[PDB]
């Protein structure tokens, strides 16, 4: 029983590929997600980073059900590894092949997953059948849009390479835990690891804003928004690879959340004008 | 019409997995082919090597064809690209994976090729079909058991250690064309390459003897047989990654041979006891 089907929107995949080139290696060992209304689901990938991170790549209206699939009206969620285990197969890498002509993904009894790919010379295809093994994962990113006052901050490219390039001069073989930090008082966050620190100053906007929009800006000036001061202790390795995974050039970069619950965000801030279909960013945990 | 169809022998091809893992990035551009007697193929894979080299595995017994082939009694000859292009897809990656439980190839219209791949979870397949495309490319190895008394030598560890780090030491970044000669009259083989050489002296087997047997022997001392002066000019790439690729700890070591027909080949010679399905060499191409 072919409980359900969707047809790959390869052509919108291209003008994305440059996007999951960046993040492959981190995304190799992990999670393919085909989730929300079963009309039109997103695709999306997960997968560790360094010790206590999550990444996140997720693409809305990549996708197009199939007709005639018994579980509609309502949600979606289908949860497996991209690189199934033994295999010489990863979805997402032959998703965003270049030579890809056309690609669906189908799912059966919801524990089987097929994916078939079909190659530029007409002719050439491959159909790989795995398992639906994931469903500890939920797709928890293209959500909590409310709430708003959150604290954030987006740093320039020029501080941005250099609090990158200062984090990884502070890398060693083991990992360390960084700990970041926001004042409301002085407009200042500061990155303080065994015993050095970075200080960084910004320009806090009065205007009440959501998202990113009304902070770009990120021209020559570093700007934030912050309600209450905030801490976060987390993985150095975590750090480094998400500011590095969301600094995508054409693209995405590196924005820093503080939400309410524990979590600091890396958020790949748009700097382009064709992602809109896409989210890019890395989870933190506090350790 | 699904015409020929074949079992691929994989637990055979698990115990000969170390020679593919070492001769892999040379093949994996390459050509898989399948030929000889319809009853029991050989298996086995080409690839350039260099500028002027052809390396070629052999594995003989490893297929087992399925009842009900319409061509039978005579022979086979299906030479296809083991990475198709586009792909994310290598025959013999997949025939040699280790945590492969099945595999088969089946071949229709002889255009059209398919693998099947059965993965350890009793559950995880992968169907790659693709077309059967390099005629051009014959099974031109196993054979020319006859004639004999050809000029070949076979140097042991040490001296073929030596050889190869002289070399080595000598590639620029263009490459170069390297005269190997041997004399009759002195047992020796000469390197030449530049404006240096390398002499190298071998005890000659008096006893007439045919392929390697009686020749073994390669413990401290080289061994040679030589009925005419030889004089070579093969490409010094080829030569390097010949004599690298036939050097698989366990299995191969080196030999040279030298063709009546203007023909170098670098043989692996068997240095184990479990490599007797299997043919490695590298024929180089006079320059």
């Known amino acids: 029983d072919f409980h359900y089907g969707v047809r790959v929107d390869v052509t ?3 003008k994305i590929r440059r996007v999951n080139e960046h993040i492959k290696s981190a995304t190799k060992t992990g999670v ?16 560790s980073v360094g010790t206590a991170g999550v990444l996140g790549l997720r693409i809305k209206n990549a996708l197009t059900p199939l007709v005639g699939h018994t579980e ?12 199934s285990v033994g295999s010489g197969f990863t979805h997402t890498r032959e998703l965003f092949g270049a030579n890809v002509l056309d690609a669906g993904i189908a799912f059966y ?14 002719l050439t295809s491959t159909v790989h ?13 293209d959500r909590m849009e409310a709430g708003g006052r959150t604290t954030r901050l987006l740093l320039c490219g020029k501080t941005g390479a250099f609090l990158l390039k200062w984090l990884r001069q502070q890398k060693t073989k083991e990992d360390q835990t960084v ?44 700007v934030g928004v912050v309600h209450t001061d905030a801490l976060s ?20 970069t590196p924005g820093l959340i503080w939400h309410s619950n524990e979590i600091l965000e890396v958020e790949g801030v748009p700097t382009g004008c064709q992602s809109g279909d896409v989210k890019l960013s890395v989870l933190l945990l506090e350790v």
């Open 12 to 14: 919108l995949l291209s």
């Open 32 to 47: 393919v997600q085909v989730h929300g209304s079963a009309c039109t689901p997103t695709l999306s990938v997960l997968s």
């Open 72 to 83: 509609g009206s309502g949600d979606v969620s289908f949860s497996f590894r991209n690189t």
């Open 109 to 122: 009894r919801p524990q089987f997953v097929r994916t078939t790919i079909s190659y530029g010379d007409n």
């Open 129 to 141: 059948k795995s398992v639906v093994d994931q469903k500890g994962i939920l797709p928890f990113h």
């Open 179 to 222: 700990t970041v930090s926001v004042s409301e008082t002085l407009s200042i966050v500061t990155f303080s690891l065994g015993g050095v620190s970075k200080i960084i100053d910004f320009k806090p906007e009065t205007k009440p804003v959501s998202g990113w929009d009304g902070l770009k800006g990120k021209k020559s000036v570093d």
């Open 233 to 252: 202790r987390v993985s150095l390795e975590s750090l480094i690879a998400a500011l590095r995974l969301c600094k995508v050039p054409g693209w995405f």
